[PDB]
Amino acid sequence: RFLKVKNWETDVVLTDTLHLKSTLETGCTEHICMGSIMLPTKDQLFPLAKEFLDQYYSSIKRFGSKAHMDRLEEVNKEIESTSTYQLKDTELIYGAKHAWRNASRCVGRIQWSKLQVFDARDCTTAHGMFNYICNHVKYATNKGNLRSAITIFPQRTDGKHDFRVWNSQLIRYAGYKQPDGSTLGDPANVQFTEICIQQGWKAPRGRFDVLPLLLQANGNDPELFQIPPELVLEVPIRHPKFDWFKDLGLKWYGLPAVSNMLLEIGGLEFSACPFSGWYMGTEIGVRDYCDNSRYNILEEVAKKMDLDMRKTSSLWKDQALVEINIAVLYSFQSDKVTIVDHHSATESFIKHMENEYRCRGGCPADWVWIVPPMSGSITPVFHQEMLNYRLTPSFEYQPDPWNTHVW
């Protein structure tokens, strides 16, 4: 109701009032916290539309104005007649930026207002989708000087004509199960890769094969496209001190671009809304490379370092982890491809969070996600109490389409 958050490093206490505007549910109850769980009609629509428009007109400082009332009137009439409504460009842009602003798991939200929004609501075919996506990819990549962007395809209508990007990210590497029983490439993408092979993709069967897009328009069966290779900026990974590091043959792609989430604005649902920023170093060096179920390279790196791997207490894992992360950042920097390390990113988030408290009355934040996956307590977010709640506009998870899709 009126909540305080304390920073335990600095003693600064901040008061949250924004949470009272909270809308969706958390999964938690008074009896059980679920903070660590990864996934915890006309009648319905007008309230959601009114809520959004009220906050929109309030943000442009014309709350209660005739133009405010008129738009509410218009949308209400439009919903009655057509059972949906169309957002104005200005509303679409505002909504997309606020969905990011409200993303409680995102550490990079200091940037939220600088989002480039590409309106793809006029798209009608999977081929159209592919053209829009390549342009997003090229724009965002901008030769290594990355720019945040989102491309928004037509909204859900009757639920039978969804636009969807079947890929979880615009750029990702294939994974293949071997006769061996080992996995080649990215183990996270084994199932998606099979759907591609099944759909007729000619798989190169290497360790770092950029997956094709599988694009669905207007509820139709998805189609396969390959992103022009010259548009997929990649970075070979080397270490500033260890000359052998290059010989592991590691590379990663420069553009992180989530394509499987749903954007809800004013009760409208954009099932295809791929969005992108730039990487925090640990996403690649810690998660992508060191997860047991990902590229899982800790053991190999440690051996080339000649650490004592006999006992865990030598911290050989920790040593190799730091090195992999140094090499990631150094390789992106040397190639002039935007990257942020976890110190500077969390420091920025702490400044962002203070602005949001001061100017908005809060900043919903999921500590489990905001604290980096290594060196947690030496970053300023570790000692920062956070309140996690769900505001709208929002990015939401949605079911993988191959479980939903009738062919």
Place this chain on the structure above:
Amino acid sequence: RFLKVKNWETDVVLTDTLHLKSTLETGCTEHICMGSIMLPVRTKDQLFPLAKEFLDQYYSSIKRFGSKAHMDRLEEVNKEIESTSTYQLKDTELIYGAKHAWRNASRCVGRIQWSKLQVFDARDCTTAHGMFNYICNHVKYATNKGNLRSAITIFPQRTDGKHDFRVWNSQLIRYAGYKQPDGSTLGDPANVQFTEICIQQGWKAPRGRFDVLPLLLQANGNDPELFQIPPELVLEVPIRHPKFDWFKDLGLKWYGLPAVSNMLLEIGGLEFSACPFSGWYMGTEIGVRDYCDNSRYNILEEVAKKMDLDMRKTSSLWKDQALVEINIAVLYSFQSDKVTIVDHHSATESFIKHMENEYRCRGGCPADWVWIVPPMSGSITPVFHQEMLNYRLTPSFEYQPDPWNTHVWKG
């Protein structure tokens, strides 16, 4: 109702039913998760159900539920509450209660050890002097010349809340902090306020970087009294690094025995406001938190300076590099001196095995991810990818206000 948890590294799915037993509140609602918030006089009326439920659990665990002994104990405790407004636990119940508060402690990664806990019954203690003696005996027993043994000492329970036994120290063994006129701090900045209290009560402060604090002990709601733990009972480890010979010259040491002394133990509705308990350290408690927090000894810059890392940009990960070296040194020093310590890899692996075991035999293992995940290298530990459910079971350890804020001074 069944709740499922998934491990994202292995895809293993467990099913929680134990959460059904949870009575106390979390802080969270349907609208707000308070999972990262650090901190989110009983009547006969409330007491009997609390007693009944404890005793039911106790008798189930000994396979005597519904027995004559069980029914007699309920009846006995009932009459005792109606007649005296409280009751006394049997020694077997006390031991059972204390083990379970630990088993239920959702923020503790060390719980695989819960059933091996030496319980010292100090319910006959009456004076601060008595407390001091019990506490010295705990420290010596638990220390065991380096081969650490878990223990808890339990002083008399709350009666009217005007006669509380309290240990004013937050931990039995801690280093003094001194705030200087130039705004810098000598020793441990976490213990500045308590140190000022000790001084005010008449402690002669050595004023060094690692001065072991006096005990400040309150018995029976009386004003607390100062005692110095015999120095020969306080095991300490000088910190050195296995390859960097200059590391010893940072002058660092730590004490071997972590012993929380400010928490409240609730068993069957009864409140044990003084119940110091100890185990052994996980290396990161000293090397990450105690040494590297900016509000603590804060040694990162000095260590990185000495390693001559590139400190001009955070993107060289100089902080991460010094952090690993400091932690290597803590583990190496404790091992070299034969003082029990566990690394965070081994400790988190043990906890996952413990957690899976608890799900099988108990139907759950409440766990607070924010606390269970170590403060460095989180995602290369097997707890990071483990979904957990946090809920409150009794018996439990609870927070209580620092006694200098509530104590009524006698004079």
